[PDB]
Design a binder for this molecule. Structure first.
Ligand SMILES: CCCCCCCCCCCCCCCCCC(=O)OC[C@H](COP(=O)(O)OCCN)OC(=O)CCCCCCCCCCCCCCCCC
Ligand SMILES: CCCCCCCCCCCCCCCCCC(=O)OC[C@H](COP(=O)(O)OCCN)OC(=O)CCCCCCCCCCCCCCCCC
Ligand SMILES: CC(C)CCC[C@@H](C)[C@H]1CC[C@H]2[C@@H]3CC=C4C[C@@H](O)CC[C@]4(C)[C@H]3CC[C@]12C
Ligand SMILES: CC(C)CCC[C@@H](C)[C@H]1CC[C@H]2[C@@H]3CC=C4C[C@@H](O)CC[C@]4(C)[C@H]3CC[C@]12C
Ligand SMILES: *[C@@H]1O[C@H](CO)[C@@H](O)[C@H](O)[C@H]1NC(C)=O
Ligand SMILES: *[C@@H]1O[C@H](CO)[C@@H](O)[C@H](O)[C@H]1NC(C)=O
Ligand SMILES: CCCCCCCCCCCC
Ligand SMILES: CCCCCCCCCCCC
Ligand SMILES: CCCCCCCCCCCO
Ligand SMILES: CCCCCCCCCCCO
Ligand SMILES: CCCCCCCCCCCO
Ligand SMILES: CCCCCCCCCCCO
Ligand SMILES: CCCCCCCCCCCO
Ligand SMILES: CCCCCCCCCCCO
Ligand SMILES: CCCCCCCCCCCO
Ligand SMILES: CCCCCCCCCCCO
Ligand SMILES: CCCCCCCCCCCO
Ligand SMILES: CCCCCCCCCCCO
Ligand SMILES: CCCCCCCCCCCO
Ligand SMILES: CCCCCCCCCCCO
Ligand SMILES: CCCCCCCCCCCO
Ligand SMILES: [Ca+2]
Ligand SMILES: [Ca+2]
Ligand SMILES: [Ca+2]
Ligand SMILES: [Ca+2]
Ligand SMILES: [Ca+2]
Ligand SMILES: [Ca+2]
Lengths: 46, 184, 608, 608, 184, 46
């Protein structure tokens, strides 16, 4: 509605629900970005 | 009600574990092998339920320890190759953070020797070095290490370290309590 | 008869107490327990009724303690998470998480202390406020209709103005009524002052008790230690907590490197070298560090000075003091690390020097910010003189600083750990240089830097809790978010360090830094209480010319004037200075005792 | 080359320095000295000019130190007297005389400090005083012609009135002129204040230096001692100083008794006994001691109060406060001893209890007298208000107390030692009971009581030297008389003790008591300087509203006002209290460290 | 000018005595026997001037000492039964109050033994007890005393006390320096 | 001369000269009032 008195609530709500979904999703999976030294050595050799 | 009130009372007096810790340890023991561990163990059942050394060594806590076999042998009962629930409890209560420094020192000394003559000789120290290092040191390197260890940690000139000297030397290290600890 | 009974009771009690701390088998322990129980049952009909009552009361106390412990272990959180972090990364990384959990517990206790006696009674009084109390507190508990329209503007809210300024979070919200109401007669200003003092007293007590438990009850024998290099690097060379394959291999390599370097150092024992280039680099680095410290001081002072407006002249520039200080607090350390590359030496003393520089920077920024804030508030109060509420303003600055610090910590975690790790993973094949095998790497957990972050935040909380009663309540949420995000970052983005050192290798190192910070933070609160005068239009102390007057006015109401005049004279400077001299003398005596004991121990060790 | 030369020089210097402390023969020592000298001569032409200059300067410093020591040993008195006392009575009796000689030296140094900068410049200015200075100082340096007729009356003189009141001995004699005269420009009030501060600073420094020399440089290895009963009572069981036959026989009997009682105590190891009569006697004695302490307080207060006259109303009653206090100081100890007969136990703890009671009585009398004197002066100043000179009056009271203490000490020495000894010698044949073989005896030297007398007198001197600049000058004569009379009394009347014990068996016991007394005596001087206002008709501080104003007015004349206002805020109570807390915290840390070191040492001793 | 500048310089370097103390000690040495002590002793005369043990023991300082003979023997030169001026100076500089604790301990240990084998055996301790006590203790009493002394002041179980053990035991006594002192 | 203004000087001077004579005399002799234990025992036996 309002550009300076209502837009920020909408943006904050969108960000909050997106962050809640991201946190819930990331609480059910076990990402491991780095690779082990064995994989690094294998890549370097090849 | 896996354990009666008196069983948990005795467990709490003997060990450093509360009822929740005893229940969690029992759950882990059952998960190690559901078939060999009876669900109901009221009475003298814990003293007679045993698991093989390999099955206990399969757990993640002891999987990567170089001295896993030594720990299992030290904390086992008179039976060879078998570990009971009571021995399991004693093992994971000794390693706890609530255990005193003296008990940890005693059991660390008992672990670090192999023959079992209450003395840390040249052979025992060499075996420990080749186990911890994974044979990544030269023979001269290793021998120099045991030479230093025996000469700087001996008071009777016996070329062997007794329990008193071991405690007096390694109880002043600030990293023994921090390292000699298994969380469970 | 009686002596034999006492000896038997003492022996049985000692055996039962020491049963757990004994290196015995379970069967032997159970046999000893049954034997002791049977002996006690036999000896029960040996003593009179008084001994039986004493034994019964002792048994009841022991049983109640055991039951309380059993209930307490059900309320300890973050055990599986800390266990996983310990097993994947080691027992030195998890020390930070255990420290953070203890800090969370202490902050929760402080929150309960400040919430039971201050926030809750005032809120209950507000809920049942009559016409008189409503009229008396409208000017401080109701937002004016002129400003109420602008209560939410993404800038009024972000600056804790509007509805937040008239909330129980700040000092100016509380009323001046000596009594909350009838049938209760609760003194709110006295509760405020006593809660502020009690929070500091309890913080001191908790830190000292933790220090004593960690040292006196655990490592009291570690004093006067020497040599034992190979013994300490071999008998304490494996971390039993580690349960990962890669971490185990890293530990094996680290212990091999440690032994090899110790033997290499002990073999040659020759130290001869002098290069002018290295000395020039070292002095240049130590000079640019001081230049950057001075630049930080100048930036903090400039940022505080530019925020010279109290009215809503502008807000995109008034919020530059939380964005600047936090920036330094989060950006200067890494730059320091880079400078540490120029000064190449032993990694342990390099880490100690880095910690010293970071601590000096933090303390300097703290002192500069405190001085600038106090000077600005004094100047603004003089210029404006109803009267402004400087306590609410100081609380707002502290709360905004804490919030910006949390935001910057989250941003730094996202950038350094997540995005850098993804960039290394997906861009190491075709980069100009091999980033994976070069300085960039994936990232290591900086235990000391993070613990210093925690200590700095806690110091801010201690400093600002007098002007903002609900600051620890917000800090609880901040600490919980910090714990969760740090756990996720270390589990997902960081790799175990190839060789991790310690600044002091002591349990009470960070606790000692925390105690020093607590003293440093109680200095300006004490100055404010002793010297500055409360505002006349806000807060609960608006009826007094001093903050302590609420206490003295009650002390003088129960103590005669003559004895009061006699006791006031001990506070004379000429009586206080000899007390300082006496304390210095006993400090010198104890230091001489310590030096003599150390010399005697060294002489005995050398002779024998 | 250079390293070898440095090593050779260091070895030669160490050998030459350690030559004296080596258990070698004289021929071996001389041979080593010649070898070292020849080696140094050979190595002289090995280094450059800078090393030669350094060696020359070191040699000159050593030679000048040796020459100064050789000159200094010619000015040490009372060596033959102390040697004779040591040979006739032992090395524990002569400790009092060595302590007294050191006290005499310290008092002489204090006298020189207070005489070079205060008394001498003022006397020289008075000698060359012009008409203006004479007119300005007539009211304080000239006795009025009305009173000049009564200047000598055996009561005006005995009370230090008349000509003594207008003498450089008292505070009111000195003038208010900021400068003594032309071409000198000597500030007398500043010199007075700085000399008063410097005397206390030097006293602290001398006591601490003596303590460090006695403990840190001599018995630093005595810490953490245990058992060794037979070793300590056999290897250190003969006094090598004793050179008398009767004293040697007494020492042999004492060592025999010591060994026999030690073996008897170690044999039975049985302690079972409970008599109601003994407990009743002990509690009765401990009650009458407290009753006598309260009676002493009441007597001191009554004596001070009755001296409520400032004009010459009467003098045979005004002099009752020096005659009463001294009486207690000299009569209550012996009564205490008699009470110690009722409380029969181990002679060592009996001596320790007697010392504790005497110290408590002395401190209580000190505090009561100080409080009563200050209250009386305040009341008199309020009643009388040119204005009276309360500083001169306080100085007069202190000087009269010291003089009466000396008189009572002389009387007690004459009565207890000389007359009692003569009575025993010439009246033991036909007395009712054998006094020679009973309690009366001839008399033993009480080392602890006499040392406490010395410490109490020195405390009076420290307290009263601000109001009486020439008090230490008189105390020098008092100490010399005391040394001579005590030596004569111990040589002529006393007999060696059959078995003499020690309260603490420590070198720095009496020095520690002296340091505690110095702090106790600097408390009220500090209060006077910080709080009380100078008289407007006497002294050098009559132009200021405070005693310290002469210092601050000069500090403010060289320091800007803004920085002064900034530094004054550190003296705030809310900043001072955290400093006290920090000092208490570091004291706690050092105490915990000492306890841990002691526990570790005990555990190591028990294990090994 | 009994001593030259260099003689007094050497004396001050070797001992703890200033020129006045050296002159006083020379005066006492001359007073012990004027005939045997030459007035002029410049050069090597002090090393050759000797007095009998009894004459030195006649002085009041050593007259009543039970161990006067032991002190004279310990501080004497290779000559037996004769004490020279240099040995006299060494003796009265060791006993001085300016001497360090270590030198006093060394010479006290050297005095307290009789055979001269650097060990305090049962016989030496018994002799010292019967000398200090003056045979006022029963044989059982004496033997009990040496039993206590040997058992509470021995670390190697040799039934004899070496110099290191003696120093470690009696250097912590506060009365050793106070007693082991002769003023002159 | 004077009874309250001059007699005390005369008394003090007499006492001072007498004390000086006593001190000088007692500085030339070696009085030892107590008797040794041997003399006490001999007297007690007889
Ligand atoms: C006013 C300031 C408001 C700021 C609010 C921002 C809150 C974001 C962090 C919230 C949080 O607690 O995240 C927890 C989440 C859980 O992680 P975890 O359970 O440990 O995962 C196990 C590892 N496999 O851990 C995570 O961080 C999930 C990943 C989310 C990405 C970072 C979040 C910030 C964007
Ligand atoms: C104001 C107060 C004024 C009081 C002045 C009184 C002065 C009397 C003491 C003066 C004095 O110093 O006496 C020294 C005198 C010398 O004694 P001494 O040399 O040690 O004798 C060797 C032992 N065979 O030692 C003596 O005491 C001599 C004996 C005199 C009797 C006691 C003196 C008081 C009467
Ligand atoms: C650790 C906890 C218990 C500390 C809490 C602060 C304490 C010291 C404060 C909070 C509430 C306060 C009380 C509140 C109300 C009253 C009634 C008033 O007529 C007299 C003072 C008195 C009795 C106060 C005394 C101090 C007090 C008890
Ligand atoms: C241990 C000794 C040296 C301490 C003696 C006290 C010292 C601190 C006192 C005594 C004499 C004093 C000085 C006397 C005269 C003057 C001249 C005046 O225009 C400025 C102060 C000055 C320079 C005084 C400074 C303080 C002073 C030096
Ligand atoms: C509250 O204050 C207002 C001020 O105008 C007054 O009119 C009203 O009567 C007051 N009501 C009360 C006393 O509650
Ligand atoms: C001293 O003071 C007197 C006071 O009457 C005065 O008459 C005289 O002139 C003064 N002389 C000086 C200034 O020395
Ligand atoms: C990983 C364990 C999660 C369960 C504990 C959650 C507790 C969160 C709040 C703790 C502070 C009150
Ligand atoms: C017995 C020795 C007498 C010689 C020394 C007399 C010195 C008296 C004055 C000492 C203080 C200045
Ligand atoms: C806190 C609630 C809002 C969180 C998300 C904010 C997103 C800003 C872009
Ligand atoms: C000291 C500070 C030096 C650098 C100042 C930068 C502004
Ligand atoms: C540039 C400031 C460096 C401060 C170093 C503090 C740590 C002292 C110990 C270093 C080794
Ligand atoms: C100033 C705060 C403490 C800094 C210590 C540096 C090492
Ligand atoms: C760092 C703290 C030093 C004291 C600060 C006092 C500031 C008063 C406003
Ligand atoms: C074992 C006690 C260790 C105490 C460590 C205190 C560290 C203080 C660091 C100041 C910066
Ligand atoms: C406490 C003092 C009791 C006795 C008082 C006597 C006056
Ligand atoms: C009647 C007061 C007694 C005071 C005793 C102080 C000495 C304490 C040690 C005694 C053992
Ligand atoms: C009060 C002064 C000190 C008294 C000590 C008694 C033991
Ligand atoms: C004992 C001394 C205690 C303090 C005395 C202060 C008296 C001021 C007058
Ligand atoms: C004026 C000289 C008075 C001397 C009195 C000595 C007693 C202290
Ligand atoms: C070795 C240090 C001994 C210190 C003795 C201090 C005595 C204090 C007595 C207070 C009364
Ligand atoms: C001091 C000078 C007078 C000493 C003799 C006084 C005699 C009084 C009777
Ligand atoms: Ca073995
Ligand atoms: Ca051994
Ligand atoms: Ca943070
Ligand atoms: Ca006296
Ligand atoms: Ca021998
Ligand atoms: Ca031995």
């Amino acid at each position: 509605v309002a550009p300076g008195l209502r837009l920020w609530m909408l943006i904050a709500l969108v960000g909050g629900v997106l962050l809640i979904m991201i946190v819930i999703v990331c609480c059910f999976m076990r990402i491991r970005i780095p690779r082990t030294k064995r994989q690094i050595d294998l890549i370097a050799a090849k | 009600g896996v354990f009666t009130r008196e069983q948990l009372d005795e467990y709490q007096d003997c060990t450093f574990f509360t009822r929740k810790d005893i229940i969690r340890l029992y759950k882990r023991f059952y998960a190690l092998n559901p078939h060999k561990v009876p669900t109901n163990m009221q009475g003298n059942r814990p003293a007679i339920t045993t698991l093989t050394f390999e099955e206990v060594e399969k757990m993640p806590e002891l999987k990567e320890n170089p001295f896993k076999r030594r720990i299992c042998e030290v904390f086992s009962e008179d039976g060879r190759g078998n570990l009971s629930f009571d021995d399991f409890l004693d093992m994971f209560s000794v390693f706890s953070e609530m255990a005193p420094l003296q008990l940890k020192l005693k059991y660390a000394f008992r672990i670090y020797d192999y023959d079992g003559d209450e003395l840390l000789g040249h052979d025992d120290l060499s075996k420990m070095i080749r186990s911890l290092t994974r044979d990544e040191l030269s023979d001269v390197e290793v021998e120099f290490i045991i030479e230093r260890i025996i000469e700087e940690a001996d008071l009777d000139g016996d070329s062997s370290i007794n329990f008193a000297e071991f405690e007096h030397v390694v109880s002043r290290s600030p990293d023994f309590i921090r390292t000699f600890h298994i969380r469970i | 008869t009686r002596q034999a009974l006492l000896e038997r009771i003492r022996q049985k009690k000692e055996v039962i107490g020491k049963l757990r701390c004994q290196a015995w088998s379970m069967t032997r322990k159970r046999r000893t327990l049954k034997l002791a129980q049977k002996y006690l049952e036999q000896h029960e009909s040996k003593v009179s009724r008084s001994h039986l009552y004493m034994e019964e009361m002792r048994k009841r106390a022991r049983l109640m303690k055991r039951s309380f412990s059993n209930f307490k272990t059900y309320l300890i959180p973050w055990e599986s998470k800390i266990k996983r972090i310990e097993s994947h990364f080691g027992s030195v990384v998890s020390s930070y998480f255990t420290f953070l959990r203890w800090i969370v517990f202490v902050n929760i206790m402080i929150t309960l202390i400040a919430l039971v006696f201050v926030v809750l009674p005032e809120t209950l009084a507000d809920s049942v406020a009559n016409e008189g109390r409503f009229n008396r507190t409208k000017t401080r508990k109701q937002i004016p209709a002129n400003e109420r329209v602008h209560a939410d503007e993404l800038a009024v809210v972000w600056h804790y103005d509007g509805y937040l300024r008239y909330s129980p979070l700040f000092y100016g919200y509380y009323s001046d009524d000596p009594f909350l109401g009838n049938k209760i007669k609760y003194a709110l200003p006295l509760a405020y002052f006593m809660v502020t003092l009690t929070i500091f007293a309890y913080s001191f007590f908790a830190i000292l008790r933790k220090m004593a438990a960690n040292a006196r009850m655990s490592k009291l024998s570690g004093s006067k230690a020497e040599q034992y290099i190979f013994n300490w690097k071999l008998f304490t060379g494996w971390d039993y907590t580690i349960g990962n394959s890669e971490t185990a291999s890293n530990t094996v390599m680290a212990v091999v490197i440690k032994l090899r370097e110790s033997i290499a150092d002990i073999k040659k024992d020759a130290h001869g070298k002098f290069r002018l280039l290295q000395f020039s680099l070292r002095v240049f680095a130590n000079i640019i560090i001081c230049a950057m410290l001075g630049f930080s001081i100048y930036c903090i002072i400039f940022a505080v000075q530019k925020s010279q407006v109290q009215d809503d002249g502008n807000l995109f520039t008034k919020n530059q003091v939380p964005s600047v200080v936090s920036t330094i607090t989060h950006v200067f350390p890494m730059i320091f690390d880079l400078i540490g590359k120029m000064e190449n030496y032993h990694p342990r003393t390099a880490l100690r020097a880095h910690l010293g520089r970071v601590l000096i920077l933090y303390t300097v920024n703290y002192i500069t910010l405190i001085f600038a804030l106090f000077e600005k508030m004094t100047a603004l109060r003089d210029r404006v003189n109803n009267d402004i509420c400087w306590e609410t303003i100081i609380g707002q600055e502290i709360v905004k600083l804490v919030t910006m610090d949390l935001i910057f910590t989250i941003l730094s975690i996202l950038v350094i750990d997540l995005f850098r790790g993804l960039w290394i993973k997906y861009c190491s094949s075709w980069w100009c240089w091999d980033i994976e095998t070069t300085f960039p790497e994936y990232g290591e957990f900086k235990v000391a830097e993070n613990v210093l972050h925690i200590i700095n935040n806690q110091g801010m909380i201690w400093l600002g809790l007098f002007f903002a009663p609900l600051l620890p309540a917000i800090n609880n949420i901040k600490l919980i978010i910090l714990m969760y995000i740090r756990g996720w970052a270390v589990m997902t983005c960081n790799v175990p360090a190839r060789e991790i050192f310690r600044a002091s290798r002591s349990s009470n190192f960070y606790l000692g830094i925390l105690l020093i910070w607590l003293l440093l933070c109680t200095l300006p609160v004490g100055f404010v209480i002793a010297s500055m005068s409360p505002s006349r239009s806000c807060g609960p102390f608006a009826r007094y010319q001093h903050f302590y007057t609420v206490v003295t006015r009650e002390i003088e109401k129960r103590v005669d004037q003559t004895v009061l005049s006699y006791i006031r004279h001990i506070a004379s400077p000429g009586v206080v200075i000899p007390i300082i001299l006496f304390l210095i003398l006993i400090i010198y005596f104890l230091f001489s005792l310590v030096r003599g004991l150390r010399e005697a121990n060294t002489d005995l060790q050398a002779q024998l």
